[PDB]
């Protein structure tokens, strides 16, 4: 079995049934199956969120450059009332999330379109609605799920590294890429900072301070500033 370590031994509760495992849980927290399903769900959740996020940020930096995706929160504009937008947002989200959670806590219990009785989703797996939720399927879930989880974990890493690269350079990830390409040698946190018993150094942040939006003036500190190297 392909393992996250060549030549090592998987733990107890890890075998390989669920895709995306290769015997990795050094803390062995996958003991309780309840929390384990909980965490499978949560990891799928985060992976999908982050995949969507990186995709959107990338394509947007592409087509509409010079718009700091990080500062889109600030510099967005729309004639619609922001309060109404966030209201619709909250309510929509409360609904969808309570649906998914009610189904998790009680499997196969909400599978119907409660409006159109004709419409009702077939039986499926928690974390795998499908049917209408997956109408067209080329290939096999055997590979689809493994690719899903792989790409999702990778995209989580992508998103967080984008955030770091912004906090350190303020540049969009593509800008930072072109920068790295320009100087392969000097474009490294290595070439940016280091720590020694004599003295320590860290790169300064580009996210300036409390952002002054339309009256609120959001306090904008840094992520764990003092321990960046």
């Amino acid at each position: 079995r392909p393992l996250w370590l060549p030549g090592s031994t998987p733990p107890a509760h890890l075998k390989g049934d669920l895709p995306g495992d290769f015997g990795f849980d050094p803390l062995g927290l996958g003991a309780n199956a309840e929390s384990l399903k909980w965490f499978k769900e949560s990891e799928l959740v985060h992976s999908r969120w982050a995949m969507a996020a990186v995709a959107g940020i990338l394509v947007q930096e592409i087509v509409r450059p010079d718009v700091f995706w990080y500062n889109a929160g600030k510099e967005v504009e729309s004639p619609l009332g922001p309060l109404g937008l966030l209201a619709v947002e909250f309510f929509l989200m409360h609904w969808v999330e309570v649906r998914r959670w009610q189904d998790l806590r009680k499997p196969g219990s909400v599978d119907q379109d409660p409006i159109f009785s004709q419409y009702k989703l077939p039986p499926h797996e928690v974390g795998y609605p499908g049917g209408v939720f997956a109408p067209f399927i080329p290939g096999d879930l055997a590979e689809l799920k493994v690719k899903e989880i792989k790409n999702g974990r990778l995209a989580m890493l992508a998103f967080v590294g984008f955030v770091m690269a912004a906090q350190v350079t303020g540049k969009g990830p593509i800008a930072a890429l072109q920068e790295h390409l320009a100087d392969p040698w000097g474009t490294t946190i290595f070439s940016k900072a280091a720590v020694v018993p004599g003295q320590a150094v860290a790169p300064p942040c580009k996210i300036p301070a409390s952002v002054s939006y339309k009256g609120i003036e959001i306090p904008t500190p840094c992520f764990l500033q003092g321990l960046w190297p």
Partner: protein, 223 residues
Amino acid sequence: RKLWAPGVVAPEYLKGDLAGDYGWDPLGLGADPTALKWYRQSELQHARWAMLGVAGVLVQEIVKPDVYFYEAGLPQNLPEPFTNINMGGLLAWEFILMHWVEVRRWQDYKNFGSVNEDPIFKGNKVPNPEMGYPGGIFDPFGFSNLKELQTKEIKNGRLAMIAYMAFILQAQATGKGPLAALSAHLSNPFGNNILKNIGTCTVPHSVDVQGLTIPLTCLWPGS
């Protein structure tokens, strides 16, 4: 069998099965077998490393007899192609690749026979007969007898460890390469010796790198 001293007795476990043995474990450290393998691996480690070290310092002292290897560590002390590189990226590449290969050797010691193949070009594997003895591609000419090979290896390696440490101390004292120190003892064996040079090392007391200064050290409070 000649032991490590005329008339001395050997410990029960020292049998010469490992080369360079003479029955010398005055502090019984070779009691546990696990730790014994650990320590043999490390001994070979240090012997080989110091062998390479004396080799390098020697050949460079010969070819460019002005570098003063003890000070060659500086970016200014770098050859034509690159002498003002970023120590940042230097450390980057170095640490990455070394951490890899060290984890490889570590998995080796942990499970002898575990990772013998090239994990990608799977038509590629080296058979390891002994812990710390890869061979195969690591032995391009396949000289493997192996016993006297190991004897000469371990013996010369211990001695090279000693020699390299000697070079370090002599450099701290006289601020000069072993070449210079030997020429000194030859110009005068009476003069040019530890009896005179003693009690004062030439430690230049915390030189400064591109970004900062590094604290400096001497083996004794000679200063």
